[PDB]
Amino acid sequence: MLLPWLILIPFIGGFLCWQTERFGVKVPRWIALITMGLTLALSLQLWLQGGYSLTQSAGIPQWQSEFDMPWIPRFGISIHLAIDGLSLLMVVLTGLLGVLAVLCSWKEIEKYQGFFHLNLMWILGGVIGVFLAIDMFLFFFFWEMMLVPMYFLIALWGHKASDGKTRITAATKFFIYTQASGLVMLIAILALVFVHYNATGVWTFNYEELLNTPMSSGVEYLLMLGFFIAFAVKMPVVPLHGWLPDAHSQAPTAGSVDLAGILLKTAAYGLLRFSLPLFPNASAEFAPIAMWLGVIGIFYGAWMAFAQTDIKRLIAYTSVSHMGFVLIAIYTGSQLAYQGAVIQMIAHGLSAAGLFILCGQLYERIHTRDMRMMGGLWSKMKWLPALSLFFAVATLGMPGTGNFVGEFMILFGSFQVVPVITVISTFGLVFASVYSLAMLHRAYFGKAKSQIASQELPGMSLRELFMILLLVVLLVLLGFYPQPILDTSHSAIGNIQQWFVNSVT
Amino acid sequence: MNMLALTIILPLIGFVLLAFSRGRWSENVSAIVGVGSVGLAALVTAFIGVDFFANGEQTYSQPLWTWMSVGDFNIGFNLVLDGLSLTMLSVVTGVGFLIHMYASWYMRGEEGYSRFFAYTNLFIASMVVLVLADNLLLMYLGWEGVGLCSYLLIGFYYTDPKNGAAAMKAFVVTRVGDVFLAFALFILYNELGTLNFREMVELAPAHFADGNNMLMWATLMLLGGAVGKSAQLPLQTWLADAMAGPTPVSALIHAATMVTAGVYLIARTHGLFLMTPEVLHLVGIVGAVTLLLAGFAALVQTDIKRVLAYSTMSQIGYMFLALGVQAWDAAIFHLMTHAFFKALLFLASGSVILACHHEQNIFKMGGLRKSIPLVYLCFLVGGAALSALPLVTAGFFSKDEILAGAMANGHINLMVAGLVGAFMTSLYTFRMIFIVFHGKEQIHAHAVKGVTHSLPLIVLLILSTFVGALIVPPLQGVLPQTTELAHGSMLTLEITSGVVAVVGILLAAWLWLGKRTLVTSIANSAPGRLLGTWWYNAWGFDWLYDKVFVKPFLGIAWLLKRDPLNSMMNIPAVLSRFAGKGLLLSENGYLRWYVASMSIGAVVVLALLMVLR
Numbered sequence A: 001m002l003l004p005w006l007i008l009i010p011f012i013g014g015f016l017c018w019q020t021e022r023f024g025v026k027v028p029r030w031i032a033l034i035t036m037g038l039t040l041a042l043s044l045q046l047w048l049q050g051g052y053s054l055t056q057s058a059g060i061p062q063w064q065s066e067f068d069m070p071w072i073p074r075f076g077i078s079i080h081l082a083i084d085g086l087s088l089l090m091v092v093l094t095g096l097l098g099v100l101a102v103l104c105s106w107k108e109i110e111k112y113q114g115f116f117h118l119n120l121m122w123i124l125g126g127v128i129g130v131f132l133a134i135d136m137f138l139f140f141f142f143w144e145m146m147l148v149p150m151y152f153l154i155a156l157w158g159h160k161a162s163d164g165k166t167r168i169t170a171a172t173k174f175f176i177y178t179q180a181s182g183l184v185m186l187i188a189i190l191a192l193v194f195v196h197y198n199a200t201g202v203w204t205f206n207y208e209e210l211l212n213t214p215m216s217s218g219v220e221y222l223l224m225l226g227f228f229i230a231f232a233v234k235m236p237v238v239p240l241h242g243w244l245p246d247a248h249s250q251a252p253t254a255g256s257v258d259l260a261g262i263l264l265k266t267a268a269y270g271l272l273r274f275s276l277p278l279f280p281n282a283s284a285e286f287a288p289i290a291m292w293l294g295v296i297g298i299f300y301g302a303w304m305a306f307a308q309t310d311i312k313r314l315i316a317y318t319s320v321s322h323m324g325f326v327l328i329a330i331y332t333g334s335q336l337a338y339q340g341a342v343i344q345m346i347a348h349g350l351s352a353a354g355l356f357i358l359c360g361q362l363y364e365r366i367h368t369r370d371m372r373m374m375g376g377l378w379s380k381m382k383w384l385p386a387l388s389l390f391f392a393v394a395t396l397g398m399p400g401t402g403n404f405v406g407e408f409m410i411l412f413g414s415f416q417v418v419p420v421i422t423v424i425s426t427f428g429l430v431f432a433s434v435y436s437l438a439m440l441h442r443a444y445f446g447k448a449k450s451q452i453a454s455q456e457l458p459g460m461s462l463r464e465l466f467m468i469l470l471l472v473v474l475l476v477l478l479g480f481y482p483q484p485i486l487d488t489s490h491s492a493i494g495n496i497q498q499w500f501v502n503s504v505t
Numbered sequence B: 001m002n003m004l005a006l007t008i009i010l011p012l013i014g015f016v017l018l019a020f021s022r023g024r025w026s027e028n029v030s031a032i033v034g035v036g037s038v039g040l041a042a043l044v045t046a047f048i049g050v051d052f053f054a055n056g057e058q059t060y061s062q063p064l065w066t067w068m069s070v071g072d073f074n075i076g077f078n079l080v081l082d083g084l085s086l087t088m089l090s091v092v093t094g095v096g097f098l099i100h101m102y103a104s105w106y107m108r109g110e111e112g113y114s115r116f117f118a119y120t121n122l123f124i125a126s127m128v129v130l131v132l133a134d135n136l137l138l139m140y141l142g143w144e145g146v147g148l149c150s151y152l153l154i155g156f157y158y159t160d161p162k163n164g165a166a167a168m169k170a171f172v173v174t175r176v177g178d179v180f181l182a183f184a185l186f187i188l189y190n191e192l193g194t195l196n197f198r199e200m201v202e203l204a205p206a207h208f209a210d211g212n213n214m215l216m217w218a219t220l221m222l223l224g225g226a227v228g229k230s231a232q233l234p235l236q237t238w239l240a241d242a243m244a245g246p247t248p249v250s251a252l253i254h255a256a257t258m259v260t261a262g263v264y265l266i267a268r269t270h271g272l273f274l275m276t277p278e279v280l281h282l283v284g285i286v287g288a289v290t291l292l293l294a295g296f297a298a299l300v301q302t303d304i305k306r307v308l309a310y311s312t313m314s315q316i317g318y319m320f321l322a323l324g325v326q327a328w329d330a331a332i333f334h335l336m337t338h339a340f341f342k343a344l345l346f347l348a349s350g351s352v353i354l355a356c357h358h359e360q361n362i363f364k365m366g367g368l369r370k371s372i373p374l375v376y377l378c379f380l381v382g383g384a385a386l387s388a389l390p391l392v393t394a395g396f397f398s399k400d401e402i403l404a405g406a407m408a409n410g411h412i413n414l415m416v417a418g419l420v421g422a423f424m425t426s427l428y429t430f431r432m433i434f435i436v437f438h439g440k441e442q443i444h445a446h447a448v449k450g451v452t453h454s455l456p457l458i459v460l461l462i463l464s465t466f467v468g469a470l471i472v473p474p475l476q477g478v479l480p481q482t483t484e485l486a487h488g489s490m491l492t493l494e495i496t497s498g499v500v501a502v503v504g505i506l507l508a509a510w511l512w513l514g515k516r517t518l519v520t521s522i523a524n525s526a527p528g529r530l531l532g533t534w535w536y537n538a539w540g541f542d543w544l545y546d547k548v549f550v551k552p553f554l555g556i557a558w559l560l561k562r563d564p565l566n567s568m569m570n571i572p573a574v575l576s577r578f579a580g581k582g583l584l585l586s587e588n589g590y591l592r593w594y595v596a597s598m599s600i601g602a603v604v605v606l607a608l609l610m611v612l613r
């Protein structure tokens, strides 16, 4: 199977990136690009050979490919990997964002750049493993391993303007939030493994076997909450979001960590792949609380974004507001909302990526991220201001940008299940418009509010233009023709939706 | 009619070309791409129209691709032409070509000549999709599009922060209407699972037979979307401020397009409003209230553009009254006639402002009738059409049809609102005309001439006369016929309307021509200073919205500025640090204390072992 190589190539390339700095400080970047290019090519090959569009839901579990190798036999833990329309779509996004993460940090050719790329490649290897792992321990291991590289990238290669103290403070907060939450999930994985043994007599960590574990209402609820705590920190779900704005602000200014370790939806997939299938009844009775937490994140994130001054922290809070819609959808039991969640998870990744990459490029010219020191940048630059407007139009969810397809599909499906929550949630589209236009008016429109913004700035390079324009084409195509993506995730999302509904009944 | 898509592709191509030009092309080349794009779309519309009447006015459908398909949710990117669409397509591309041609002269020498045409091209394409869409979700892609393009053009002069504020307000107020529209789309699909206009009205009767309770909510939410784009109560606080964009934009986003979308929507979904009569009547009441409220506001405005903004609000009000009285054909007739005189008035207003060196106050100007003659004639013909001067102007025929329909259907109270609004229209329209052109010169306007400026002006002038009343919109087949008034009763209304229209103009002359003493006395009167201030601020809806929405929102933003919930989740760490320092207080290097610590531990361990034995 090739599934194992979607995780190995990134890891092997990371080692090569470090061992090739001896041939020059301009070599590691090419090794990283080839590494991510090969993983992306392999992902596309799997897409063109799986016939996902013609796969009909046969019921969980339903994998197009699977690999199993003994890892820790004593505990029945193995390297079990499996692909599906949902997982495939998340792996190809990781490959695309990984190539862009390498291209964005291309002018960074300082010493120890090999270790930078090693950490970047390993963050991506872990993310791909999280989307492929079907062994509960492998899932947890990949969930927690990807955090160590991220910690050192935010603390040692973080915002060039921030002091070491501020960067470390942010990295520690991110790690403690995430590793501790992940540990609460291990406690629940271990409890599920023991409840299975006691109820049946088998010792397994395989998701396929633990899918129907006879358990009481109380234990199922506690086990479900344990997984949710881990998926609430990475989504994020308010009030476990404080770590996000800080990490984004102190992360490599170029935007590499932002795209690789913060824009891949490993928590939304986790809620759809494990929480909903493993604990169907508990998820159904927690739906009200989860959906209301999402509504709060929609308005709280929007208000927090409006008052940010820092452009990168503004974009960071917009993510909390947008992910609230996905949380509401995951707990509706509607195929339309689930399919829309998949589109939004992909669209937000592309729209947020563009904003984060453009933010880094802007810093390279004005050496500031404070919007109070910008203004009239539309008349001082050649592309950045116009392209930032596009990504903000997509962020507010303009029809024709792909973010609209996901957001409206979620609302249409959610309305059929929870009408009142859908009505209040739709008003979030007005708040989005407020923060989206606020950022454009406070940075590119009006008059220069500082001297640096009052001089013609260097123009965007071909590399910068290519990566940003690629994201523009993808968002527009996803907005006008989203069917090819919907046809790939239909079987997987159908299996999950049926399981949840049928199990609750 | 197979070229129906070209009416969108051509404008869309113009946008991409002019956007990626980034201002590198010459003004002439940029104009050729901008005006030619809309011009070719208008030519295609003409050929499509010829084929439509040739094939017996049969509805044509052009399925392009399936946009979204998830189970029973099957939305299609399909276009449709039936007559209501043809009328709207003709106005959008036709009047849209003339405004583009005029804009070529108006924006000469200004920065962003290319970006302006790029946005106006995207606006046209969005409006065409809005009108040709066969389903509500595709209509949304085009409803929201025109809103974006309006935001982009209202704030075209980005250097001025005030223009940006006006653009943001427009987007927010209209987006609140778009949220209401969305609710309707969410309900209709949950109830019918179609969103296709034809299928919806075909499957609606049976589903709501037991109770149309959910149908009323959908039609009410459809009205919410309409009152937003059409600037009707309670979402009309954005039109007057939207007069910050280049004047040509005002003509497009008023007369031609945008403000007419709400009328098209209620007209396209008439079959559903008919099943909800109470909501349909509310459409009439909203129009009557807006036409009256907007007329008074226009009578006290001092900016030429703002008088023409509140007049559009009153004129869109008449079309809304027409829909509520079930005079569907009359509403579309007035939309078309309005697209002529209002565009003429706005384009003429631009010529006046440019001639008066960017002056915009009606006072501070004067005696321009001698300096700018053609522009003065355009204002006279446009103002007469707006005031519905009898027989000579097309507005007379379009408005009388609205008033006739209301009376024919028994809506006497609404017809009376129309009659009093007509008197107000004459007063506010000629007050401005008698103050800007008649009187003593004060600015010394510079003659504005050349084709690209006069041609659009003249073509709209002819269309603004009775000649425009001859362009009968093809509607039999799409919209129901209106109850016919008796000939004798019709003549009475036509005479009354004419007398009211004329008397209005005569009073306007006597009041705002010469020393203007009586008006000054009333204006300086305590009642006058109070009512004048109230109407000048549009009855104070803007003030109320600032105190109920903007101020509360900004206050909560200031309160949460420091992420309170994050600080709450930092308590586990403040307690940890404090506990650590307290525990380290036992780490005094004193050994005797260390020995005592083990003594205390022994007593505790032994005590517990005995109490837990």
Ligand SMILES: CCCCCCCCCCCCCCCCCC(=O)OC[C@H](COP(=O)(O)OCCN)OC(=O)CCCCCCCCCCCCCCCCC
Binding pocket: A168, A169, A172, A173, A176, A177, A178, A180, A181, A184, A229, A233, A240, B569, B570, B571, B572, B573, B574, B576, B577
């Ligand atoms: C079930 C509950 C709901 C779900 C929870 C999900 C997981 C949440 C995990 C995080 C819990 C809250 C943590 C809040 C603080 C986060 C950052 C942190 O640990 O300390 C940051 C703080 C900053 O200060 P410093 O680093 O010195 O920088 C210079 C001065 N500002 O550094 C300090 O000076 C603090 C020193 C102590 C830091 C470690 C102790 C704080 C956390 C204790 C454990 C809390 C409970 C975790 C249980 C597992 C997860 C549920």
Ligand SMILES: CCCCCCCCCCCCCCCCCC(=O)OC[C@H](COP(=O)(O)OCCN)OC(=O)CCCCCCCCCCCCCCCCC
Binding pocket: A378, A381, A382, A383, A385, A386, A387, A389, A390, A393, A398, A399, A400, A401, A472, A473, A474, A476, A477, B008, B012, B016, B018, B019, B020, B021, B022, B023, B112, B114, B115, B118, B125, B126, B129, B141, B142, B145
């Ligand atoms: C191969 C597959 C093909 C499909 C995918 C490719 C299509 C994408 C092309 C269009 C989308 C992006 C728009 C262009 C991005 C940047 C281009 C550019 O440089 O345009 C600049 C232009 C004005 O230029 P200028 O006056 O010079 O000022 C800018 C700085 N100099 O300023 C601008 O134009 C501002 C840029 C954003 C404007 C609004 C964004 C539009 C969003 C699309 C939503 C569509 C909704 C309406 C559609 C209805 C009709 C179907």
